[PDB]
Enzyme design. Structure first.
Site, PDB file in Angstrom:
ATOM      1  N   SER A 271      40.000  38.716  38.914  1.00 20.13           N
ATOM      2  CA  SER A 271      39.095  38.765  37.524  1.00 20.13           C
ATOM      3  C   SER A 271      38.541  37.232  37.721  1.00 20.13           C
ATOM      4  CB  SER A 271      39.853  38.789  36.453  1.00 20.13           C
ATOM      5  OG  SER A 271      40.503  40.230  36.336  1.00 20.13           O
TER       6      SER A 271
ATOM      7  N   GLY B  66      37.024  36.842  32.531  1.00 21.66           N
ATOM      8  CA  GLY B  66      36.634  37.987  33.287  1.00 21.66           C
ATOM      9  C   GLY B  66      37.255  39.372  32.835  1.00 21.66           C
ATOM     10  N   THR B  67      36.887  40.559  33.553  1.00 19.14           N
ATOM     11  CA  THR B  67      37.300  41.879  33.184  1.00 19.14           C
ATOM     12  C   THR B  67      38.806  41.897  33.591  1.00 19.14           C
ATOM     13  OG1 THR B  67      36.937  42.702  35.190  1.00 19.14           O
ATOM     14  CG2 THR B  67      34.855  42.604  33.793  1.00 19.14           C
ATOM     15  N   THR B  68      39.150  42.805  33.039  1.00 17.84           N
ATOM     16  CA  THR B  68      40.863  43.239  33.329  1.00 17.84           C
ATOM     17  C   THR B  68      40.945  43.437  34.704  1.00 17.84           C
ATOM     18  OG1 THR B  68      41.266  43.438  30.889  1.00 17.84           O
ATOM     19  CG2 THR B  68      42.841  43.994  32.360  1.00 17.84           C
TER      20      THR B  68
ATOM     21  N   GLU C 140      38.954  47.200  35.536  1.00 15.61           N
ATOM     22  CA  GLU C 140      37.880  47.792  34.557  1.00 15.61           C
ATOM     23  C   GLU C 140      36.543  47.157  34.963  1.00 15.61           C
ATOM     24  OE1 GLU C 140      37.128  46.289  30.041  1.00 15.61           O
ATOM     25  OE2 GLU C 140      38.708  45.246  31.046  1.00 15.61           O
TER      26      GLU C 140
END
Ligand SMILES: [Cl-]
Ligand SMILES: [Cl-]
Ligand SMILES: [Mg+2]
Lengths: 196, 241, 231, 250, 4, 244, 243, 222, 195, 204, 4
Positions: free
Chosen positions: G74, G29-31, G46
């Site tokens: 995330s 996943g995204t940070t 993010e």
């Protein structure tokens, strides 16, 4: 019953008579109506003896479990747990309860919980059948930030009068002192308080 | 071999899931130890904070179950906290139902029974933890009782748990062989803690700073854990020795 | 492969294959498009038939006076989810005298779908939805996928060959986003977007389905001779 | 969530064996030896207190348990399984007997109830059989003294004397030589202590042997006086000292 | 019943 | 989920047999043989114990023969523990009937309900069947003396003479040979013991490896008595027919 | 083997492979990050811009619990929403019975126990998220990170997702270079920088930054999103540093 | 009923009369109102006869199981808590009024329990219809620091006040003494001050006085 | 409802039951048969609360007929009466009890004896030579105490019954519109058509 | 409207020298109307005898219930239930119905077949045991029975003397109660023979 | 119901 709790300079004091009634018969003349639900959170019990004991036992249990998980509960939190019980079971309960405790942040606090389960935070509180006779007196004599000795005298004189006029109050006057210094139990016998 | 996934017997009469739950016990790579004084029960456990980003104060495997009972866990923290919350609930309920504080050994038995159930009923997995309970019981005096994923429990003179447990165990056996008694013949809990740290140092062959350890003391009517500073005070006194 | 037996199983790379297979029925679905300005929001859907003797499966469902959606994939699953939306919009009215925010509709669908992706015995929903509406903060378009992911957009499209329309809308953005106070122009743009996804077929009178909602238009659906205006 | 294991985990194989019961018996085979001998005026049950670590205090771990004032039990197999069976056995003596008839159940009937519990773990959904065999020694007014063995299947049998676990085959042979229908209780204790040495490796004293009797009523163990029809528990655990007294005259 |  | 570990105890084979019933029957075939024989003036139940140890308390023992009510008893072949579950059910069921109608339960009615319980474990609930076959021996004033058997399938049938458990093939052949309709009880007692004597897997039949019961009108006038034989009584009847 | 096909099964090493596979979904996943500061906490994440068509500012991912707690995560977004919904019920019931708003440590264990519960049975799947959350209570500020296993600890700073390592390194510097403490408005800027730095590891698609915070002095102990001049100012401070 | 409890030096003593009433009628002249909860915890019960017996046995049963489970001797406060919570749950409908006393590892204890579930602590207590007669005596003669023999006398004197002065109480005095470190001694019919006088006449009839219609032997056998 | 009688003679049981059905100040019907055949040799008459009576009778009838089919056998009158009693004994502690009283007349073919059972709504069962429910008993019991003999024929029984009906028509406040009489014997159940 | 006195009836029990007697009347009525003259109120389960007064439907039901329970007891225990034990079973069973009781006044009588001791007991409708040396009484004429018994009774009567005494207590009590009488039965119970006698009494 |  006659009961009361009074905040002062160093904390709070709870007071009560020692009479349990079973008609016009005194079933117990040395009752302890002042009850611990946590180290420095106590309550005064009035109304049904069975109801108030059952309630206090449950509250003590909740706060013991609270303590284990989240540390020392506030006096407000303890009063909230009493309320929840009294309010939700208002049809089946006859319980007039005063909650009093000592935080180090909040100093002394008093919450009174009358029959319907409403909550009222006050400088001092009086309750029980005998309290009717001392509304006049207590309103005239209470001040904020009294000393320990002044507060003991205020409670002693007030409950003396409640006991004098109320047939449903009597025996000894018990008090519980709640400060940073710990917990102190006081007792005053008829021969002292009667002739005040 | 589906007798390896759930808690049913294997042909040799074994429970692999229980055995593998024991292996998860060491996942954290911490060693704990408990001893009894005259007046107290001390439990110490290694404290390892790898990541610099962690708040070190929130990293603990010692739990205050009741006013009088403490519990140290060997095993992963989620299972450890699951077991601690249950123990706290059981100890509070016991007090309410029966009007006196739950004894250390009875709590140990109760948690052991709960663990036993997970070894017999299929839908529940065992917890990958070993629970060491400590108190100064009002009837039995200083007490150490320990639970494992098999549902086994027993009382100890002293005990240790973790990967390097056997070293610590024999170290302690050798002391009691010599001392000829059941416990640490010491007045103050401060010195019993010192003994505990000292014999952990010898058995593991390593030194400790104040942030490498974690200490719980049980006295009559309270169980408490020490700050970094109470431990430093204690490490200092061992050095001047 | 060994990890696609049910939704309650992760694969070793952290994937959920039943959810991914649910996503696949959307891809086999007939194309549908959503887009919006600041004053209106439009759905266009290509309806599919069984053969020349059959009806053309409806893909647009009204949820409230101010809300509705288009479907791509398993139709009964859209019926279940649209019916849930009708109830949620309804509950907001009867209890709070409040028209349900399109954003909340989004969050409510996400949470409903998610439950079926974490428990044994259930199954993920096999349908994608485009939700449009006009509420207290203006026109909205949402994209729902049965993974539970819901996304607010100026425009989008789902179903087979939806990538044509989704590219077209991506370039057209600056134009259609500012078709305010003109229903028929926003619809025209929507019909053109969907045309980028046609192959061997073009839009007939009992093939095209359009819906619009906005400032002073209740969500209404156009089919049959009512869409001839747009072919 | 919740138990979705509502089907049996013990089923018949094509040869007719019930695998999990067989495997449970194998776990009992592994278990430390325990035994019981029936005398004319008593029953004795005994086992080895084989400690896990010498730091463990093995008096805190009781392998021989009081069930009623006249009934005791010992086991071979998995200790935790035994512990919860004792809990359940004690309770069922009350709920399904004492609270109904105002008296404690006779041995066979309490045994019957324990067997029922163990049988249910053999057929109910989502559970495995108990990994233990019990020996239950008891007394009741109309049956006198009796000794029963209960197995993981839920089957039970009355014995004059028997042994279970590790060295049971050898110990059962030993007991056939020595047992007769004229044994006075002290003789049975003695034979039990001899039989048990064969199977014990290490230390053999009153701290490593657990041993209890069902014998005479013990008024001194009652806790009160004034009801002359209440005479006290027939169950008694022998002390560490009592055992060592009988080991010097071995 | 007992009252207070 | 848990579907992975489900044996599916209540399904059909491709041949249309119930695996678990078949395998339960296979289990029963290694159990001590039990025989029922019905005479005009009574019934015999005889059964062989699963091979004794000399130290077994044989007189205060029961493994094979159980009393259901005063007019009905059963002989067991299979898992004892399974059988007791069913026996207490049957005992309770008998009492419900008596309580309801103020008449002792007709033998078939009791047998049918037990068999109906067994049947249920083969069709629903996903549990293993009971690994038990019964021989029911009883009297009622409709049919008089009756013998029945039931097995894990919950199928039941009536008999003049029957065996269950081990070596029923040999035993059934022998009963067929010597049984005859006008037989008295005392002849049936002999037939039962002689049949076990020849089918036994032991070296020789002794009192301590047996359980025995009769159901006669041999009390006083038009009423019925169950006699569960004591060990010494079997030892005598074993001599009386010259097997020892 | 086959130990990895069923949640709550121990492998022979003592692991629950299904939880470990859930971690892969988190790492995918995204940070997202959290920075603890003088009198509060800051959360940042993010948001990958899949397309021009995503309405900017209008797919909010940070979530409030009660009035004083922020949560970010995330991995599988719906799993995170499910967790926050439960957190909201847990906080409501605490406040209902005890009056006071739920303390952050207390709140952390409520989520922890609930997540850990989903590793006990084969009929549920573990959560496919790592969750960073925290706020201000009567005892000050607390930041927490919680993993699919149910494991959680208190953090000076925390990061998760694809840029977790990059971000972790960046957090470690701040902790060393600001040992007396970091101010709330400082932390907001730092958070923007670190998300921009950790966006290196995810850089096909450009992204949208989102920040929130609780500070005893700056937000009165309440959770608020960072928008307008304060957000743009922290974006600018980040832009400065990657050049 | 009359029942009392009195503490002393090294333990506690309880006592009770032995009359049971069905309205104005004496149903039982010698019933036992002293109940054993555990060997060293005894209970005196007034109110609905069946309720006091049933509630006392139930809690006695659960205390036994609890004592076995914990490997500890039972405490009075456990009986107290279990009794009170049970009685409270039943809102007074279980008409048991109890004086609970005993010795345990904590010491010696004396409590009363009313049917709605409230409990009291004291050195001397009385319950039942005769409780005022008894309490008059207790308030007159009780002192701090009673010996065992003084306590027994005081208790049975209080029960006697009930026997003579209360129509709800009569017949005999039962006592139970629970001293620390010793076995409880249950003194059934400790006092018997109401022995029926010799009757004036024997009413034994000439055999054959009663007219019979039929006889028959009843079959009790099998 | 109101009047139901039964007499057991040497070789049969005779049941007589009033024909009137009254609600308010209107006799709605004068040909009501207050009876159900439970089996070919068992008959049950009933009286009590409106609706409850027929619902109960038909429910028992359904249960007895089911038993007959299942076992291909007729339950004895004693057995049927015990079944019926238990049903009423359960009912009396239900949320709404059946307020129905019954007489069960049957010929037991195993014993070759007629049998009459009187059962009230509480489940109070008694076997009798003659029986009645309601106010009817207050005239008939004494009359039957006088005129009844154990060995009477079916014809003697019917004459005895004529006496009972005559007395009830003389002294009862209500017009119960006569009785339907039915005989239960070794050959089953039949109805007398002119009474 | 008082269920314990709709049907009427009485039961009395007495101990003698190595014997017990238990007796009942035969009336079953519906208030003023006498209905049956053959309604016996005493039953036995092996050698243990139970008399039950009160509401007749409950009398019948409880007999059927205790037959059930003692039959199963016998099958499992392999012996007949003794009076002390049966007394406990009666108590449990009645108290189990504490807030919806059977309106009955049961009485147990018999001789313990191990110890030879004669045993009697009585119960209230909710299970309270009244054990007594001398006599137990029950029913609508219980006041009268108490009076008759307390004056007529003396300890250690021989079976044929005890018979006269219990019969005279029953008869004369029944005659002062409108709801009791219409016949009577007396059981004389010795260690192993039991005689049952029907008394001749006034039929009004 | 008797009382005490
Ligand atoms: Cl109080
Ligand atoms: Cl437990
Ligand atoms: Mg008359």
């Amino acid at each position: 019953t006659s009961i009361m709790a009074v905040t002062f300079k160093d904390g709070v004091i709870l007071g009560a008579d020692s009479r349990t009634t079973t008609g016009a018969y005194i079933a117990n003349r040395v009752t302890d109506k002042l009850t611990r639900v946590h180290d420095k959170i106590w309550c005064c019990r009035s109304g049904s003896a069975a109801d108030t004991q059952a309630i206090a036992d449950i509250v003590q249990y909740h706060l013991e479990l609270y303590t284990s998980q989240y540390g020392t509960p506030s006096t407000e939190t303890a009063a909230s747990v009493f309320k929840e019980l009294c309010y939700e079971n208002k049809d089946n309960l006859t319980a007039g309860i005063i909650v009093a405790g000592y935080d180090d942040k909040n100093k002394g606090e008093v919450y009174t919980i009358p029959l319907g389960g409403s909550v009222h935070k006050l400088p001092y509180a009086i309750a029980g059948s005998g309290s009717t006779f001392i509304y006049g007196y207590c309103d005239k004599n209470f001040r904020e930030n009294m000393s320990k000795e002044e507060t003991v005298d205020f409670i002693k004189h007030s409950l003396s009068q409640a006991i004098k006029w109320d047939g449903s109050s009597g025996g000894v006057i018990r008090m519980v002192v709640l400060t940073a210094a710990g917990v102190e139990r006081l007792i005053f016998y008829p021969d002292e308080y009667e002739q005040l | 071999g589906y007798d390896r996934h759930i808690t049913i017997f294997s042909p040799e009469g074994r429970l692999y899931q229980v055995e593998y739950a024991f292996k998860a016990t060491n996942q954290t790579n911490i060693n704990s130890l408990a001893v009894r004084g005259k007046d107290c029960t001390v439990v110490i456990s290694q404290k390892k904070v790898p990541d610099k980003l962690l708040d070190p104060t929130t990293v603990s495997y010692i739990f205050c179950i009741s006013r009088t009972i403490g519990m140290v866990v060997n095993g992963p923290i989620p299972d450890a906290r699951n077991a601690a919350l249950r123990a706290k609930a059981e100890a509070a309920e016991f007090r309410y139902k029966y009007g006196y504080d739950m004894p250390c050994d009875v709590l140990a038995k109760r948690m052991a029974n709960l663990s036993q159930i997970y070894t017999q009923r299929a839908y529940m997995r065992p917890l990958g933890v070993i629970l060491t309970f400590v108190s100064v019981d009002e009837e039995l005096g200083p007490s150490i009782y320990k639970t494992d994923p098999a549902g086994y429990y027993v009382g100890y003179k002293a005990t240790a748990t973790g990967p390097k447990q056997q070293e610590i165990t024999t170290n302690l056996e050798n002391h009691f062989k010599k001392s000829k008694i059941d416990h640490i013949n010491e007045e103050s809990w401060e010195k019993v803690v010192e003994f505990a740290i000292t014999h952990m140092i010898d058995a593991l062959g390593t030194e400790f700073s104040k942030n490498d350890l974690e200490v719980g003391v049980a006295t009559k009517d309270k169980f408490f854990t020490l700050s970094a500073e109470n431990i430093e005070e204690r490490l200092v006194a061992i050095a001047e020795q | 492969n060994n990890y696609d037996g049910d939704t309650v199983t992760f694969s070793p790379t952290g994937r959920l294959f039943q959810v991914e297979y649910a996503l696949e029925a959307i891809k086999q679905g007939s194309v549908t498009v959503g887009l919006r300005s600041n004053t209106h929001a439009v759905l266009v859907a290509l309806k599919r038939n069984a053969d020349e003797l059959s009806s053309y499966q409806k893909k647009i469902i009204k949820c409230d006076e101010h809300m509705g959606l288009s479907l791509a994939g398993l139709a009964p699953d859209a019926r279940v989810l649209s019916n849930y939306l009708r109830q949620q919009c309804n509950y907001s009215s009867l209890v709070f005298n409040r028209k349900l925010a399109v954003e909340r509709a989004g969050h409510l669908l996400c949470d409903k779908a998610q439950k079926n992706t974490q428990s044994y015995g259930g199954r993920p929903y096999g349908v994608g939805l485009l939700i449009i509406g006009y509420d207290k903060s203006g026109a909205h378009l949402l994209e729902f996928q049965p993974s539970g992911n819901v996304t607010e957009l100026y425009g989008t499209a789902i179903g087979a060959r939806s990538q044509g329309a989704k590219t077209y809308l991506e370039r057209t953005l600056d134009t259609f986003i500012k078709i305010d106070g003109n229903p028929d122009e926003l619809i025209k743009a929507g019909v053109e977007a969907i045309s980028q996804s046609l192959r061997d077929e073009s839009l007939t009178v009992d093939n095209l389905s359009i819906a619009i909602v906005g400032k002073d238009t209740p969500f209404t659906i156009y089919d049959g001779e009512a869409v001839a205006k747009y072919i | 969530m919740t138990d979705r294991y509502s089907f049996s985990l013990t089923t018949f194989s094509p040869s007719g064996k019930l695998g999990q019961i067989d495997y449970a018996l194998t776990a009992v085979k592994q278990g430390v030896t325990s035994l019981g001998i029936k005398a004319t005026n008593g029953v004795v049950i005994a086992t080895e207190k084989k400690s896990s670590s010498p730091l463990a205090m093995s008096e805190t771990l009781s392998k021989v348990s009081l069930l009623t004032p006249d009934i005791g039990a010992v086991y071979s197999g998995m200790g935790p399984d035994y512990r919860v069976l004792v809990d359940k056995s004690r309770k069922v003596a009350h709920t399904s007997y004492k609270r109904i008839y105002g008296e404690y159940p006779p041995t066979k009937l309490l045994v019957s109830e324990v067997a029922k519990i163990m049988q249910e773990a053999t057929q109910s959904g989502g559970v495995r059989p108990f990994g233990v065999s019990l020996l239950i020694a008891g007394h009741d007014e109309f049956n006198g003294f009796s000794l029963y063995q209960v197995d993981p299947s839920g089957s039970y049998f009355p014995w004059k004397a028997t042994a279970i676990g590790k060295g049971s085959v050898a110990a059962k042979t030993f007991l056939e030589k020595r047992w007769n229908d004229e044994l006075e209780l002290e003789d049975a204790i003695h034979i039990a202590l001899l039989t048990l040495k064969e199977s014990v490796e290490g230390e053999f004293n009153g701290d490593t042997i657990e041993l209890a009797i069902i014998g005479d009523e013990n008024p001194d163990l009652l806790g009160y006086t004034g009801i002359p029809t209440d005479k006290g528990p027939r169950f008694r655990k022998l002390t560490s000292q009592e055992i060592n007294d009988r080991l010097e005259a071995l | 019943a007992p009252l207070x | 989920g848990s579907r992975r570990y489900d044996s599916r105890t209540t399904i059909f084979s491709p041949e249309g047999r119930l695996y678990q019933v078949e395998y339960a029957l296979e289990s029963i075939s290694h159990a001590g043989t039990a025989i029922g024989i019905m005479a005009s003036d009574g019934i015999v139940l005889a059964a062989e114990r699963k091979v004794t140890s000399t130290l077994l308390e044989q007189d205060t023992s029961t493994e094979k023969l159980y009393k259901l009510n005063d007019k009905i008893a059963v002989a067991v072949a299979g898992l004892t523990a399974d059988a007791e579950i069913l026996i207490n059910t049957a005992r309770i069921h008998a009492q419900n009937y008596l309580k309801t109608y103020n008449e002792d339960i007709p033998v078939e009615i009791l047998v049918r309900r037990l068999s109906d319980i067994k049947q249920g474990y083969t069709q629903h609930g996903g549990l293993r069947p009971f690994g038990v076959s019964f021989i029911y021996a009883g009297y009622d004033d409709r049919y008089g003396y009756q013998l029945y058997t039931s097995n894990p399938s919950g199928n039941y049938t009536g008999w003049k003479a029957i065996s269950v458990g081990a070596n029923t093939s040999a035993a059934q052949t022998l009963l067929q040979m010597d049984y005859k309709d006008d037989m008295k009880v005392d002849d049936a007692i002999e037939l039962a013991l002689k049949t076990l004597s020849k089918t036994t897997d032991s070296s020789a039949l002794t009192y301590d490896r047996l359980e025995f019961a009769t159901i006669r009108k041999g009390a006083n006038d038009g009423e019925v008595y169950q006699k569960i034989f004591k060990p010494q009584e079997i030892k005598d009847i074993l001599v009386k027919t010259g097997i020892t | 083997t086959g130990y990895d096909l069923s949640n709550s099964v121990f492998s022979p090493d003592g692991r629950n492979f299904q939880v470990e596979y859930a971690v892969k979904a988190v790492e995918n996943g995204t940070t997202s990050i959290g920075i603890k500061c003088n009198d509060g906490v800051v959360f940042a994440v993010e948001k990958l811009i899949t397309s021009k068509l995503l309405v900017p500012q209008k797919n909010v991912k940070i979530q409030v619990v009660d009035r004083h707690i922020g949560c970010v995560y995330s991995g599988l977004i719906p799993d995170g929403r499910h967790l926050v919904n439960r957190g909201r019920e847990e906080a409501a019931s605490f406040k209902k019975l005890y009056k006071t708003p739920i303390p952050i440590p207390a709140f952390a264990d409520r989520l922890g126990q609930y997540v850990q519960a989903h590793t006990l049975y084969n009929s549920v799947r573990p959560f496919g998220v790592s969750t960073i959350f925290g706020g201000v209570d009567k005892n000050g500020a607390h930041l927490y990170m919680l993993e699919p296993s149910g494991s959680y600890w208190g953090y000076k700073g925390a990061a998760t997702g694809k840029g977790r390592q990059s971000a972790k390194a960046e957090l470690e510097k701040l902790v060393d270079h600001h040992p007396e403490g970091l101010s709330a408005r400082e932390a907001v800027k730092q958070a923007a920088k670190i998300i921009y730095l950790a966006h290196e590891d995810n850089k096909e698609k450009d992204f949208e930054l989102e920040i929130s915070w609780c500070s005893l002095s700056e937000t009165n102990g309440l959770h608020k999103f960072v928008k307008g001049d304060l957000l743009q100012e922290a974006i600018d401070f980040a832009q400065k540093e990657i050049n | 009923t009359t029942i009392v409890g009195v503490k002393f030096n090294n333990g506690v003593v309880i006592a009770a009369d032995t009359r049971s009433t069905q309205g104005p009628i004496v149903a039982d002249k010698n019933c036992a109102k002293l109940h054993r909860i555990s060997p060293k915890i005894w209970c005196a019960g007034a109110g609905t006869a069946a309720d006091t017996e049933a509630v006392t046995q139930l809690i006695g049963s659960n205390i036994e199981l609890h004592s076995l489970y914990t490997s500890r001797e039972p405490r009075v406060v456990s009986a107290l808590q279990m009794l009170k919570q049970h009685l409270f749950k039943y809102q007074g409908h279980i008409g048991a009024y109890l004086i609970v006393a005993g010795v345990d590892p904590t010491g010696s204890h004396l409590f009363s329990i009313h049917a709605h579930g409230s409990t009291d602590v004291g050195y001397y207590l009385s319950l039942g219809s005769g409780s005022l007669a008894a309490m008059a005596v207790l308030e007159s003669h009780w002192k701090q620091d009673l010996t065992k023999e003084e306590a027994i006398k005081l208790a049975s004197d209080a029960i006697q006040a009930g026997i003579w002065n209360d129509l709800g109480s009569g017949s005999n005095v039962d006592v139970c003494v629970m001293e620390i470190g010793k076995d409880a001694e249950y003194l059934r019919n400790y006092l018997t001050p109401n022995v029926r006088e010799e009757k004036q006449k024997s009413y034994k009839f000439p055999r054959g006085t009663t007219a019979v219609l039929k006889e028959s032997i009843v079959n009790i056998c099998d | 409802m109101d009047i139901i009688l039964g007499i057991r003679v040497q070789d049969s049981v005779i049941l007589a039951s009033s024909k009137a059905v009254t609600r308010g100040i209107s006799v709605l019907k004068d040909s009501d048969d207050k009876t159900r055949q439970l089996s070919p040799h068992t008959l049950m008459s009933f009286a009590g609360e409106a609706g409850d009576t027929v619902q109960f009778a038909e429910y028992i009838q359904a249960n007895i007929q089911l038993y007959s089919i299942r076992e291909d056998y007729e339950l004895s009158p004693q057995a049927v009466s015990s079944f019926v009693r238990q049903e009423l004994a359960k009912s009396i502690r239900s949320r709404r009890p059946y307020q129905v009283n019954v007489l069960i007349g049957g010929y037991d073919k195993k014993k070759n004896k007629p049998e009459l059972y009187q059962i009230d709504y509480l489940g109070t069962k008694v076997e009798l030579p003659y029986g009645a429910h309601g106010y009817s008993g207050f005239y008939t019991f004494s009359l039957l105490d006088h005129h009844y003999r154990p060995d009477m024929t079916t014809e003697e029984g019917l004459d005895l019954l004529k006496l009972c009906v005559q007395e009830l028509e003389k002294r009862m406040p209500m017009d119960f519109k006569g009785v339907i009489v039915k005989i239960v014997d070794k050959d089953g159940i039949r109805q007398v058509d002119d009474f | 409207s008082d269920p314990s006195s709709i049907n009427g009836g009485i039961v009395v029990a007495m101990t003698g020298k190595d014997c017990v007697a238990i007796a009942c009347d035969l009336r079953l009525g519906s208030q003023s109307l006498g209905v049956s003259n053959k309604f016996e109120k005493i039953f036995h389960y092996g050698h243990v005898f139970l008399g039950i007064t009160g509401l007749a439907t409950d009398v019948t039901t409880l007999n059927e219930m205790f037959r059930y329970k003692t039959n199963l007891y016998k099958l499992k225990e392999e012996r007949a239930i003794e009076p002390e034990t049966f007394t406990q079973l009666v108590s449990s069973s009645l108290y189990e119905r504490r807030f919806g009781p059977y309106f009955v006044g049961p009485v147990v009588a018999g001789i313990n077949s191990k110890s030879g001791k004669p045993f009697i007991a009585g119960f209230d409708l909710i299970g309270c045991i009244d054990e007594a040396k001398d006599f137990i009484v029950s029913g609508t004429a219980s006041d009268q029975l108490f009076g008759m018994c307390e004056s007529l009774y003396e300890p250690n009567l021989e079976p044929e003397d005890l018979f006269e005494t219990i019969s005279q207590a029953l008869l004369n009590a029944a005659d002062r109660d409108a709801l009791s009488g219409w016949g009577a039965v007396v059981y004389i119970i010795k260690k192993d023979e039991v005689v049952k006698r029907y008394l001749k009494m006034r039929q009004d």
